[PDB]
Structures are given as C-alpha cells and as structure tokens.
Amino acid sequence: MKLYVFLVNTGTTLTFDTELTVQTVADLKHAIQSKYKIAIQHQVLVVNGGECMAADRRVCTYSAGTDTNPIFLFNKEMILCEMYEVAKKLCSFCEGLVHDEHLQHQGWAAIMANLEDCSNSYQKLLFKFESIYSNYLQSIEDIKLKLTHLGTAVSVMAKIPLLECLTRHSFNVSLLDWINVQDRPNDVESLVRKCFDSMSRLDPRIIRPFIAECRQTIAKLDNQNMKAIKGLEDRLYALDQMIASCGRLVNEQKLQNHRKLLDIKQKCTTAKQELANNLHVRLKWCCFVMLHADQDGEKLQALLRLVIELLERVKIVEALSTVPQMYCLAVVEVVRRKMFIKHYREWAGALVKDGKRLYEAEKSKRESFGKLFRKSFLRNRLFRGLDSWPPSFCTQKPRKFDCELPDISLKDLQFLQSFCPSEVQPFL
Amino acid sequence: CSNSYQKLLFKFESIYSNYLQSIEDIKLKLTHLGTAVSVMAKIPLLECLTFNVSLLDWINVQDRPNDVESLVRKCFDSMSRLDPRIIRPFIAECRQTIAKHADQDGEKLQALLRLVIELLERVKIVEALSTVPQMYCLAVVEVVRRKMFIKHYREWAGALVKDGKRLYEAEKSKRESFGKLFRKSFLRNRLFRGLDSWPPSFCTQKPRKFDCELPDISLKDLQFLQSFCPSEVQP
Amino acid sequence: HTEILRGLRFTLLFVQHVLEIAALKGSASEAAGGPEYQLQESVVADQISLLSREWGFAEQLVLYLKVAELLSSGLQSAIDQIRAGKLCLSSTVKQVVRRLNELYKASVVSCQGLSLRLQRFFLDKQRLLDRIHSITAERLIFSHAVQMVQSAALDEMFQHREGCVPRYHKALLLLEGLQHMLSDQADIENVTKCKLCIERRLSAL
Amino acid sequence: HTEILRGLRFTLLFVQHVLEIAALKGSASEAAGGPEYQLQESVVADQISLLSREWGFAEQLVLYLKVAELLSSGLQSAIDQIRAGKLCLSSTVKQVVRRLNELYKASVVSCQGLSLRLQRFFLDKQRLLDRIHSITAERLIFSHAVQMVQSAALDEMFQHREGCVPRYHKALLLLEGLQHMLSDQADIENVTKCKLCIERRLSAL
Amino acid sequence: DLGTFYREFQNPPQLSMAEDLDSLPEKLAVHEKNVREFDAFVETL
Amino acid sequence: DLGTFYREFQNPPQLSMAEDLDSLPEKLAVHEKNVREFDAFVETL
C-alpha cells in the first residue's frame, strides 16, 4: 500500500511508495524524490508526534505511513528556493486547513524536538572537548618533556649496540636501527614528527577561538529556538476561534452569511498564507542554525578524535622510552637463563644416573627373588603381594630447558658491557 | 587292535619303570618332606596373619579340603596301586600277557598311568612344599629386604622431590620477577623471544605409593621367627 | 503313621555313619592290597597326622555339633512321634529314641572335645579360626564319601569287589543322608551326581 | 597521437611530483604547519633525523630507484613513439622528452651517489637488510599522498582556509599516478576509494 | 559303569567360621538342656 | 561532502632487502647504459 504523508513546505500533503510505507525509512528517503518532490538529499521528514524519520528504522516501526498520524515533510529544496452544498464543502476545506494548522504545529514541535536533541548533543560534546582540551592544555607541558626524553633515549639507543647473537633469530649496528627496523614506513622519527604536528595543529591560539565561536553558535541556536518557535505564538487561539466560528456558521446555514462565510473561508487563507510567512521565517533560522551546528559539530568530534589520537600515540611514544634499560636487563636475564639451564641440566643428569642405578639394582634383586620362587612354590599364593616391581622413580630425562630461547654468549655480554653507553648500569 | 591304543600306557610303564626307583627316590623325598613338615611345625606362622599356629599347621590348614597328611596318604595309596612288590610286577606281567578285544587291560593301564602321572605331579607339589620351609625363610628375608628398600627409597625420593620443589620454586620466582619487569615493553615478545617460557618443573614432584600390597610381615618378627627356628634357618 | 520318628531315625542312622566317618578321621587305615612297599610312608603319614591330629579331631567335633543340631531338634519336645502316632503302641521306638539321645550325649562328649579344640585354637590359630571361612561339616562328609567311592573303584580294578559292593552301598546311604542334608543348591547338584554314581555302581553289581 | 602525448605528460607530472616527494623525504619541512611550531620539536626532529639519516637516505634511494624504473620505461616508450607516432615531431613533445631526459640523468646521478654513500652502510647492515622485509616504494608514495591529504583536510578545518585547492589538486594527481603504477587489485580497491573521495571533495570548487 | 566311577573320581563335584565357632559353648548348653528335657520325656514311653 | 571526507581519510587503507641490495650494482650499470643511449636519442633533436 502506497504511503500517504504530509509535507509542510508542500501544504502538509505527501505520497510515497509501498516500500516507503512498510519498509525502512530509507525507502521513504528514495520516495521523497517521488510524488513530484525532491529526494531526501533535499528534504527532511518526521513522523507524527515529532518522531524523526530514521532511514534505517522501518516505517512499520514509525507507524506514520498513512493519513492517520501521517509523517510531515520539510523540503530542503523548498528552502533552496440550489447550491446549498457549499455549506459543508467550504467547511470541509477549513477543517483540513484547521488540521493542517495542527499539522503545522507538529512540524514546529518536531523542529523544536530536533533542536532539543541538537542542543543536548552539541552541549554534551562541548564540555567533553572542553574537558579534553583543558586536559590537553594541562597535558601540553607533560607531552613536551616526554618528547625530549624520547630524543635522549633515541641517542642512547644509537650508542647502544645491536642485537649481537639475536640477529640469527630470523656487524657494527645499533638497536636504534633495530628499533627503527620494524615498521619501515612508520619509523620513530615519523612518530615524533606526527606528534608534534598534531600538537601544533592543536594550537590553543586557534582552539580557544574555535571554542568561543562554537559557544556563540550554540547560544545563537538557543536564541533561534526561543525566537523562531515563538514566531507563531498567537496563531493557535486565533485559528481556533476562526474554526469555531466557521463551524457555527456552517451549522446555522442548514445567503446573508453565505458570502460572509465564503469571505471568512477566504479570510482563513490569508491566515494560512500568514502562517506560511511565519514558517519560512522560522525555517530559515532552523536550517541555518542546523547546518552551521553540524559543521561545528563533527569538527569537535574530529578534534576529539584528533585529541584522542594524540593522547593515543602519546602512550606509544611513552612506550619506547624504557627500551634501552629494558633490553640491557633482558641480556642479563637471558644470561642467567643460560646458566640456570646448565645447572639444571647437571642436576637432572645426576638424578637420572642415580635413579637408573637404583632401578637396575632393585630390578636385579627382584629378578633373583623370582628365580628363587617365581611360580616355584604354592607359598606364592598365600604370600601374594610381594611380586611387585620396586618403586618407579624418575630415571628418565627432562623434556627441554626452554630451547626456544635465542643464542647468546657471556663473552658477548662482556663485549657489549664494555661497548655500551651509560646504560651499562641497567645491565651491570 | 586295542593293544595299539594301550601302548600309550605301555610306554608310560617304562616311565613308571623309570619312576619305580624315582618314586622310591620320591619316597626318600617324601621322608625329607615329612621331616621338613615337622620342622615347619617347629616353625611359626603368625607373621602376616590374615594366630600363634605353626608353619606346618597353617600350611596344612591353608587348604581345608586337603593337607600334607591327605596328600601323603594319597601318595602311599598310589604306591600301593603301583606296588613294586606285586602291582608293578603285576602291571609288567599284564603287559607281557598282552601278547598271550583288549579293551579292559588297556583301559586299566591307561587309568593307572593317569593316576601315576597325577601322583608324580602331586609329588612335585610335595617337593615344592618340602622346599616351602626354605622358601618361607627366603620369603621372610625377601620381605625384610623389601621393607628396607621401601624405607630407603622413600627417604631418597622424598629428599629429591623436596630439592626439586625448592629449585622449581626459586626458578619460578626469578622468572616471575623478570616477566613482571617490563611484561609488555619494547615488543619483548617480538624484539627478544621465548623468554616467557616457564622453567620445567617435572622433577619437583614426588612419587606415588609403591609395593603397598605387601603382606605386612614385620621384619623384627621375621628375625624372631628365624631365631626361633634354627633348624634349616639358612634359607 | 510313623514318619515323625522314622525320618529322624534315618537321620540318626546317617548321624551314626557320620560318627563312624569321624572315627575314620581319628586314625588312618589301609586296604586295596593292604600295606605297600615302604609302608612306612603310611607310617610317615601317621606321624604327620599325629602332628596334625588337632585339625582332624576338630573337623570331627564340628561334624558332631552339626549332627547334634538335629539331635537336639528331636530331643526338645520329642513327643512329635507320639502326636503322629509313631510312638502309639511303640515304646520300643521310644527306647530307640533314647538310644539316639545317648548318641546325642556322645555328641556332647565330642562337643567337649570341640571345646578343648577351640581353646587350643584360640591359643594357636586364633586369628586363623577367625578368618577360617572353613568348609561346613557337610562338605567334609561328602569328601569322605567321595574318597570311599574312589577307594571302591580302585579295589574293583584290583579285583577285590567283594566288599567294595558293601562300601558302595554304605556310600550310597551316605549320599542319601547328605541329600537329606542337601540344603544348598550345589548340594542338590552334588546329590544328583551321587545318584548317577549310585546308578553306575548298581550297574557294576 | 596527442592523446599519447597527454599520457606521456601525465607520466611526466607524476614523475615530477614523485621527485618532489623524494626530495621532501631527503629533508623534512615543517613550514606546512602554518601558524607556528614548537622550537624543541624542531630540535627533536633535527636530532632524530641526524641520528637516522642513513636509513632515511636508504628509503630515498629506494624511492629514487622506483622513479628511475618509471623513467626507463618512459624512455623505452619514447623510443617506441619515436619509431611511430611522432606527431609532427612536436616541439612540445621534444621539450617534454628533453625534460624527461634531464630528469633521468639526474636520477642516474642521484642513484649512483646514493649507492656510493650506502656502500659501507649497505655493507655493515647486510644482515638486518636480509632479515628486513623491503619497504615497497608504492607504499611510500601512498603514505606521502595520505599524509598530504590529511594535512590539507586539517587546514581546511580549524580555519587555515588557504592553499587547499593546490594541495588537493597535487594529491589528486599523485593518487592517479599511484593507481596507474598500482598493478595490484587488492589495494587498488582502496586506491580507487581514495581517488573517488578526492574527486567528490573536488566538488567544493 | 566302572569308567564312569573312575571319571567321577577324576573329577568330583564341589560345593569367617568364627561366627559359628564362638557360639559353641552356648549351643552346648542349649543341647545339654534339650537332652535333659528329652531324658525326662523318655519316661513317658 | 569534503567536510565529511575527513572521517574516511582518517583511516589508513594500507597496502629480504639484502636481495635488492645485491641487484643494486646491476640495475645501476643498466641505468647508466640506458642513460647513454637516451642521451644519444636526445641528440636526434
């Protein structure tokens, strides 16, 4: 069933396809181009009750695709540019216009609704960025000294030797290159340069003026919401009085008032035209605030994303700092691991030898006992239980003393210790 | 005819002829067994009871249906059935007269041969039982040795397990310290590699129970019984 | 008319035969050719049995108690025969019952032997007698009967079946008594085997 | 033939822009920041580049080598178009070819000098180089294009509001060149996505 | 017949005792009482 | 659109060396010869 809707910019009337009526409101977005209108790229719509037309949301979930509680449409493209039967027929037009006034009220209400969400959404991010930037403002000094420490560490790493035996993991060289080796398009210098580039791009000299501009825009949006919505403050009561008078006159009609009612019907259109005047007056305040807000909106989010990312890489920037002392300690750790592997191998060998000796001797004793009496006397049944083999100790060998550890040399450790920079204490 | 079938027991008769002295030797073996039964009566049986009776007493009672006297009388009866004085001479006379429809003589000879073979097997059992006082003194020695070995093995294995536990704990502590220090710095899993391997600790564990099914004959009680039975106390 | 006494009388004849079996358990014997070459082997067996006479006498006294069970069963309120009319004009049957009562008194003497044996058992083989799980007297009686049958077969082979027929008859009566005492299912199967054996013996007659 | 001439000229412009990227790789400039830059950052980046010049020079050599390969292909195609399709021996074509030849000679000189400089460097760092997976030149070109686009967008926002059209056109040309030299559909999808994005953003003008 | 008997000899059929052993004096007293009762009873013949 | 493009461009749709180092002298000499040939071709102007 094809949809029946409203369009305030088009006299509160609209039509759409059946998919627009039942399926996701993206079908309604497509059908906006239909029914002699521009597409949703040049339109904006909301369901009765102010429900914003979410394209993904099913029109069935919207429940406004028919003339009953029909959705209203705001056209952005519009912003981009004998004879007694009349007693009811004239009144017939008025009531629809009267309902249109109510329909008109909903659109402003829906417009206000979006502003409320817009105001909330904008304000929420505002403080979020405000805190973040202030956090960043405080963090500005913190990041700086960190970068200098990173540079000093890079120099030390240059002074620091290369991997020595670890190269064979698969000559004169430094861990700095080894550090620089990984992620060839993303070297350390690239990281530092990107960080400082964001920092400069995060200039408070611009951020603060941008923040002030955003605050002024938000205040202007609030004022427009106060002003444009108030633009039709006096309409409701006057329209109600006119509609009541029209109803009473039509009822009395059952031709002195006939022209009077006809003129009153004509007089209504001027109010309707006057109503249109308030609309575009209000509508201009809407989109202009809306568009500008959207332009500022994502920017802060993008700024936040930029703010977040700068925070993000800052940690990674911080991460590389410990690498020199970390590797210096790691060398000694691997050396201790090798020594422990040696000692453990010796202990395991001694234990295995003793266990093999004892197991062999006990097996010999058991063999002698069996030779004496294995099935050699009925006394075995009565004396059952002694035929057990002796204890099964651990005469076997260990599995592996962490073989996957890479190769290293203690003399290589001494050579590195002699050759290394002041990080020798971290490896002392 | 039936003599061909009876030739099985006829061949057994030569073995019986061989056994004729062997049974007489077994008779001597039987006398030694009786002396050993008396020595087993002097010997005790209380160790690993499962009280105060003798070794020969327990052995005879070890089977309620039959005992040493039962098998001894059975052996004497078998000797009578194969009597060298008459029956064995009678058996040989029958074997000769076989050459003088032969179902009866063949069946009798085969049954007698089966009985004699059973008698020889029982004699072997008797000989094993006559060894059984020696085998009992030996089994007591073996049980005491097993107790000593179990004690020594328990001590050694426990010391080994404790030392291995101490070593594994110390290594795990050092490894945990090293891992905690820069648990995820400088791409330790990438820059270095394999340091995360926890040191092996299989040697730390202790062995399970072994030789638990021992009849729990006390070694000191074994020595007491050995001293109380000097007669053939050597085994 | 005389069942309440005659059944107990057959049971008591079986008891007397069991007493004879116990007596045989008291001392060894030789037959089927008599003593053999180196009959000291039989004398050796006698020496061993003397060394072990305690267990044999104990088995005999256990059998005596097992029979004394039914003996006391008859003795306690023994007017069942009269109530069945067995004793009606049968004072001689009552005298036979009194003879069976003197037999129960002999069983009491054997039970005194049993008391001495049990005292000696608590002295030596106390825990053994505790874990004895030994064969009931019925199994021992059946084993003695089977040994008698085997001796009878050996004698029949030895062409001395003159008295072996009487031995077969006595063993058949023993089998009948055991069947009267055949409480267990395995006892019933063994009694069927003994019936087949008695049929074979009658065939050998 | 002038269409082939335009294709050659597009190759030429892509080559020139790639050479500019290579030069920037030789030495980085922070003047693109706009308003200002912390002096320490300049000092820190200076120290870093001084420490890592060798590997940076190596990346420069790889880029220049890719440029040279492009130039050699263009020269072979130039010999081909000389064989047929000279298009009246267009003086414009002659000047384009001469500029290309001068660039090629510059590329050869640069490659020779870079190789001479890296001789000891390539010598000492042989083991890691063997370990190291090569840094694809096309990857470097894409990275320069992406960073340029990102900086241009940041300037578009945050009220720089200048030079955006020039940098945008330049990056569009660079992306088109990369796509022409892409020859791998997997990332060619992403390349086409970026090109379409640039074209769509070009609607701002 | 004889062969069957020999086979039966070759393979005869087949079929904690402190539980019965301990009750020996009690059963002895019970049997003594029953014997005395029957001794009195036998005079009724 | 262009303002919206930043989100898309914010994400990187991203794309043994000693082997290349070996071919360096060969490619260099090949380039030198090609340079001589190309200069000769240029002389045709």
Short mmCIF file of all heavy atoms in Angstrom, two decimals, chain B residues 7 13 30 35 48 55 62 116 130 163 169 179 197 208, unseen atoms left out:
data_model
loop_
_atom_site.label_atom_id
_atom_site.label_comp_id
_atom_site.label_asym_id
_atom_site.label_seq_id
_atom_site.Cartn_x
_atom_site.Cartn_y
_atom_site.Cartn_z
N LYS B 7 49.24 -99.02 24.06
CA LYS B 7 50.67 -98.75 24.00
C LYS B 7 51.04 -97.41 24.63
O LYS B 7 52.20 -97.24 25.02
CB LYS B 7 51.15 -98.80 22.55
N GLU B 13 54.63 -97.12 31.24
CA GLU B 13 55.15 -98.11 32.18
C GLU B 13 56.67 -98.04 32.27
O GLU B 13 57.23 -98.18 33.36
CB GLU B 13 54.71 -99.51 31.78
N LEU B 30 59.83 -88.01 50.00
CA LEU B 30 58.68 -87.94 50.90
C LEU B 30 59.13 -87.92 52.36
O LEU B 30 58.55 -87.19 53.18
CB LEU B 30 57.74 -89.12 50.64
N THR B 35 60.09 -84.78 57.41
CA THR B 35 60.99 -84.11 58.34
C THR B 35 60.83 -82.60 58.26
O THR B 35 60.80 -81.90 59.28
CB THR B 35 62.44 -84.52 58.07
N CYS B 48 52.33 -61.85 59.33
CA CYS B 48 51.45 -61.53 58.21
C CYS B 48 50.18 -62.39 58.23
O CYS B 48 49.70 -62.84 57.19
CB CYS B 48 52.18 -61.68 56.87
N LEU B 55 53.97 -73.07 61.13
CA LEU B 55 54.07 -73.02 59.68
C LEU B 55 53.43 -74.25 59.05
O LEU B 55 52.63 -74.14 58.12
CB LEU B 55 55.54 -72.91 59.26
N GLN B 62 46.01 -74.29 55.30
CA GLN B 62 45.89 -73.34 54.20
C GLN B 62 44.88 -73.81 53.18
O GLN B 62 44.22 -72.99 52.52
CB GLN B 62 47.25 -73.12 53.53
N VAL B 116 49.15 -92.44 38.08
CA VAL B 116 50.57 -92.35 38.41
C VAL B 116 51.12 -90.98 38.02
O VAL B 116 51.95 -90.41 38.73
CB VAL B 116 51.34 -93.49 37.72
N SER B 130 58.02 -79.13 50.52
CA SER B 130 59.18 -79.52 51.32
C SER B 130 60.31 -78.50 51.21
O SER B 130 61.04 -78.24 52.16
CB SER B 130 59.65 -80.88 50.83
N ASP B 163 64.05 -31.19 47.13
CA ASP B 163 65.06 -30.36 46.49
C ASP B 163 64.56 -29.83 45.15
O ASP B 163 64.76 -28.65 44.82
CB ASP B 163 66.35 -31.15 46.30
N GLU B 169 60.58 -23.73 42.62
CA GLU B 169 60.02 -22.53 43.21
C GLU B 169 60.96 -21.34 43.01
O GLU B 169 60.51 -20.25 42.65
CB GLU B 169 59.75 -22.75 44.70
N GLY B 179 59.56 -11.51 34.25
CA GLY B 179 58.40 -11.27 33.42
C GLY B 179 57.63 -10.04 33.85
O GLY B 179 57.20 -9.24 33.02
N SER B 197 58.86 -18.55 28.52
CA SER B 197 58.76 -19.96 28.86
C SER B 197 59.03 -20.18 30.34
O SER B 197 60.11 -19.88 30.84
CB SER B 197 59.75 -20.77 28.02
N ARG B 208 54.46 -41.77 43.65
CA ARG B 208 53.26 -42.30 44.27
C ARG B 208 53.61 -43.47 45.19
O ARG B 208 54.78 -43.82 45.38
CB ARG B 208 52.26 -42.73 43.20
#
